Design a protein around this ligand. Structure first.
Ligand SMILES: NC(=O)C1=CN([C@@H]2O[C@H](COP(=O)(O)OP(=O)(O)OC[C@H]3O[C@@H](n4cnc5c(N)ncnc54)[C@H](O)[C@@H]3O)[C@@H](O)[C@H]2O)C=CC1
Ligand SMILES: NC(=O)C1=CN([C@@H]2O[C@H](COP(=O)(O)OP(=O)(O)OC[C@H]3O[C@@H](n4cnc5c(N)ncnc54)[C@H](O)[C@@H]3O)[C@@H](O)[C@H]2O)C=CC1
Ligand SMILES: O=CNC1CCCCC1
Ligand SMILES: O=CNC1CCCCC1
Ligand SMILES: [Zn+2]
Ligand SMILES: [Zn+2]
Ligand SMILES: [Zn+2]
Ligand SMILES: [Zn+2]
Lengths: 374, 374
């Protein structure tokens, strides 16, 4: 009934920074060659979507944001081989083209077809499939999931188990896999180690899950919102500290608590000062610190390179280091085999129409992940 | 005939920054418990010794500098078990106490007994073994090798092969092992990779030797002094670039030459700007950059953390990551078995009394390593 034909549907449009999302009708074009049109079933609210609203992350406006989601293929364009109508799918904000130097490298995952380094807010072909009030609307990270339907390039979608619960596994499309992989793949946390996790939102709790799965002996959660300590302990934190409770800098607190520095630290907030504090609190000769949080646009940090010369390792990653199209179906299979839990991340489930309330919940500190259901 | 007695001998004393060394008589106390007094045979001039003169590297003055050297044990204090009078030895500017958390860690080498982080310029017991003009003189990094005799703690000396040529193997005490290990141990350069080495002095040439030993396919040397290129190519560089020859920043040049970024880069100069350029020229998703050069005291660099978030790894190390007392005798053994060459690093030889001419040669750009003979 809809294949080959323009779909009119509801979406949340962001016309301008620092405004509520506008829920209104949009026009979704049919998929061109190597494109996939998806009916959305559930989408999570990730802090990166809020960074578009706040100006922290710059991408062309107006835009349909949303990138952490799951849905069902409505139709495919000519030449698509990896998904078919009716398949359950997760869109991928980091593509996996399989052909570039990064996709061919055993470790790398930041495929050169990504829309993050030089954001265009289009399909791979440089055009948009969305119109609203007769105006073309930009895409976001090749995903755009705050819409009843979206169109994505084939390299930005993964087919998943037909029995998957989409209102939970949408988190594997971004926040869970990012945090979990940051611990198990990027840092390679070791049995018996001491970890410090700065930021106890959805991504930080997923880092804690990964540190616990790797056998860390101590996992210290750090957040300025003490309401986020109870859930952090439930998922594996052994202690939590609030920087605002201390007269001294938290890096010195954490160094003393760890008898000279932690083995692994994670910055899962997106602040320059906490990136430098997280580096400093890892042990100077052999510690490893991983940046996960998104820094504010165009701002540089300042640090003393003696922190590195003594032997620290500093790294960052997108999407937990996972090659996205290969890994997402495997992570869904692991969840269905009960290898990890997603329910601890989900504090609110709301109809899509309540998107702005979901963002208010995030900004107020009250939620971890809100899942929006279509 | 000197055991247990004060030795009067010549040393090069640095009374003030930015002044020539003063070659004059000092008094060297006999070794206390767990200390070793060494008759110096040869010492190299490492840029780090010049950094003390320039104030780039802050350590208490007045001081006996020098740290890359080899000599013969004159006497041992009570309790010394790892060397005996007559043994050939190399002093270690990074100790290996064997008892701290770093010494016990499989990767770490920056032993907590070091005198680098919070310099005191003393023996481990907090006192000095040197007097000059009746005044106490500081030690440097627990070594102080610009003297006919020095006293070191047992944890800062390694026994080496009795047949070793001391006028060559002194370089294993600092510059050779630092560069070589930075490639083979810290970066873990892989076969077929592309490497970029910033700074083609003694340490950078040793990085090139390590990259070649690791089987790198391309090794790009970077220096603003084109007179350094011929020797860089002799030891393994496949190509050399002078940043001053180009209209665009060298990170852009290197990214284009490597078809999107190098696999491994090394900063082996000691400038904040080149630390950031070297990080930037490694491939954004899977590149690794190692800081080897010493930054000017207490200065911070400025960088955009998106360079790390895409996937880069940034690390530094002291002494090529080698656990010093374990590794130095094995590296001497490997040298004696012809596994690496030191002659390419030695461009000038001088008697110790011409130390100031040796520093002039380094500062003018003319030398790689000058070896001083006592
Ligand atoms: N690298 C990647 O691939 C990904 C990066 N991100 C970024 O990770 C970050 C975290 O995302 P979420 O967990 O969704 O965000 P969130 O907002 O739910 O969690 C952030 C936590 O940081 C705490 N916090 C804020 N300022 C703090 C401070 N000075 N000190 C200590 N804690 C502080 C907050 O109270 C909150 O609990 C964001 O910057 C997000 O954009 C998210 C997913 C993918
Ligand atoms: N991490 C460690 O354990 C060690 C660190 N060091 C440090 O490594 C560094 C190199 O030491 P050496 O090889 O002895 O010094 P060196 O002075 O012989 O070599 C440095 C090279 O950098 C070149 N250079 C200077 N400015 C440059 C610029 N803007 N761009 C490109 N090239 C430039 C110079 O022309 C020179 O050839 C020094 O900072 C030294 O203190 C040395 C030994 C141990
Ligand atoms: O949350 C999804 N993607 C993020 C990844 C880090 C940079 C900003 C966008
Ligand atoms: O050259 C020898 N040691 C150096 C190591 C890096 C910091 C300054 C001292
Ligand atoms: Zn790719
Ligand atoms: Zn996200
Ligand atoms: Zn030690
Ligand atoms: Zn040195």
């Amino acid at each position: 009934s809809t294949a080959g034909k323009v779909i009119k549907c509801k979406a949340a449009v962001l016309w301008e920074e620092k405004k509520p999302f506008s829920i209104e009708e949009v026009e979704v074009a049919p998929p061109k060659a190597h494109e996939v049109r998806i009916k959305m079933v559930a989408t999570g609210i990730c802090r990166s979507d809020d960074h578009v609203v706040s100006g922290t992350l710059v991408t062309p406006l107006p835009v349909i944001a949303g990138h952490e989601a799951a849905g069902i293929v409505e139709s495919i364009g000519e030449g698509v081989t990896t998904v078919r109508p009716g398949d359950k799918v997760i869109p991928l904000s980091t593509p996996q083209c399989g052909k570039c130097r990064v996709c061919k490298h055993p470790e790398g995952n930041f495929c050169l077809k990504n829309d993050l380094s030089m954001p265009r807010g289009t399909m791979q072909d440089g055009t948009s499939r969305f119109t609203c009030r007769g105006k073309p609307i930009h895409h976001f990270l090749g995903t755009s999931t705050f819409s009843q339907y979206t169109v994505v390039d084939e390299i930005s979608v993964a087919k998943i188990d037909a029995a998957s619960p989409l209102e939970k596994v949408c988190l594997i499309g971004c926040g869970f896999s990012t945090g979990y992989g940051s611990a198990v793949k990027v840092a390679k946390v070791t049995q018996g180690s001491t970890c410090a996790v700065f930021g106890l939102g959805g991504v930080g709790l997923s880092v804690i899950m990964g540190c616990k799965a790797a056998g860390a002996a101590r996992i210290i959660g750090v957040d300025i919102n003490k309401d986020k300590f109870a859930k952090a302990k439930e998922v594996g934190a052994t202690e939590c500290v609030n920087p605002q409770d201390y007269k001294k800098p938290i890096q010195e607190v954490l160094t003393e608590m760890s008898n000279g520095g932690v083995d692994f630290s994670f910055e899962v907030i997106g602040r320059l000062d906490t990136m430098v504090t997280a580096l400093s609190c890892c042990q100077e000769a052999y510690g490893v610190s991983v940046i996960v949080g998104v820094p504010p646009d165009s701002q540089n940090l300042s640090m003393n390179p003696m922190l590195l010369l003594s032997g620290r390792t500093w790294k960052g990653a997108i999407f937990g280091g996972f090659k996205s199209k290969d890994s997402v179906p495997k992570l869904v299979a692991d969840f269905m085999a009960k290898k990890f839990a997603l329910d601890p991340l989900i504090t609110h489930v709301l109809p899509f129409e309540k998107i702005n309330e979901g963002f208010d919940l995030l900004r107020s500190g009250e939620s971890i992940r809100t899942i929006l259901t279509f």
